[model samples]
Target: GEELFTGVVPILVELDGDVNGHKFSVRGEGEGDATNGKLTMKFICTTGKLPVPWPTLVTTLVLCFARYPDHMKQHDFFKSAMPEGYVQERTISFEDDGYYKTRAEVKFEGDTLVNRIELKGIDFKEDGNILGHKLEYNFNSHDAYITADKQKNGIRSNFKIRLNVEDGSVQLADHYQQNTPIGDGPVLLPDNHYLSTQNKLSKDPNEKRDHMVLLEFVTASGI
Candidate 1:
């Protein structure tokens, strides 16, 4: 129901889910209108790790919730169109700014919510610096992972954002061993590197063998 604009009150929506093996929970708030309203969502990977270049990752996630019912329908339409599997690659943005090229691969097993998304060639740039990598929103394992094959302007980073389903906790690993060799470990990040000490879990010297980041989330509403 539409309420008069007598005062500002906060309406919060908390979402919890597990992908593949990663677990995540998002806290969102907004006005009560479904069609003509905006929501500010805070995402926390309580069980897994999040991708590097947080800006781009956050931007991509934000857009997923931006337009409300319209966006939901768009996703549904695609799922219906390609129930088995679908892959598409396209560029988003202008030529001057070096358009962002993305390759998205979606898979539908049975349940609509059980689908998977693989987004590659995602460009994360700030102040003219660009970080090239890929992001996987794997509902199968209930987790999301980010990877970079090579250095981005001398910064070489690779990691996984694992979300825990039970405790709603998130874990960041320099290199998710599941995808790497049996004994091989993540490359050490430079002390001065942007992502060097970003993850709080990477603070320990012994734990530094493979960097890690742990995150927690909090949400509130008001009137």
Candidate 2:
């Protein structure tokens, strides 16, 4: 049951209760697992008002790992900061680069705590063009540590990113970002920077994914 890409949407998140071992990894990818594979752990909330009574400043996005092996730069971890001008060529023509998927962006500035990472379809040499499609490598977080396990209260952060493609340098894969602050008033997160709503997620029970989300999240005394 796989053949839905082009803007696929299939979300079925059922977490009633009970927790053990835990191995529920649902990365993202439309209809039938689009190349490189991704199943769950989604984020794309434009507007949905309900499930109130949430406070602690939550913005949690969890999904630990995922892999790809089309082989081309073999394996040589992250090293890239591409932003001061952007555009590094290779839109797509036949690919094989590196760093298939790595996403992290935790926010909390003013007390110091911001870890932004966007390693999408990156590729450098051995066949480049952003390696296919995955771009967003932003780093922030000087060194942080926070933990809570007694009911449920969490916020852990870690980011040490570096990626350089074109068959020369690579070093990325040490990306971990956690945010737990849910409901009470405002704490909306989802707005990478337009694209009709970056990475679209959750909708389509059969069809009609409902497009028109505006994209706006900036609360906590600032908007």
Residue 103 C-alpha lDDT in model 1: 32
- Give each model's clash number: 29, 30
Error of 1 at 17 (Å): 24
Runs in model 1 lying further than 4 Å from the true structure: 1-52, 58-76, 94-97, 110-223
CA deviation > 4 Å runs, candidate 2: 1-152, 162-164, 171-178, 184-223
Global Cα lDDT for candidate 1: 0.27
Task: Score every model by TM-score.
Answer: 0.25, 0.21
* Residue range 4-49, candidate 2, lDDT tens digits: 2223223222111111211122122212122333333322222332
The digit string of per-residue lDDT tens for model 1 on 1-223 reads 1112123323333334332223344333232222233332333443344323333332223111112233222221121222333333333332222233333333333322121223343233432222222322221121222232234211222334342222343323222211111122233212221111111111235432222222222111111
Highest lDDT model number: 1
Model 2 CA lDDT for position 96: 36
The TM-score leader among the candidates is 1
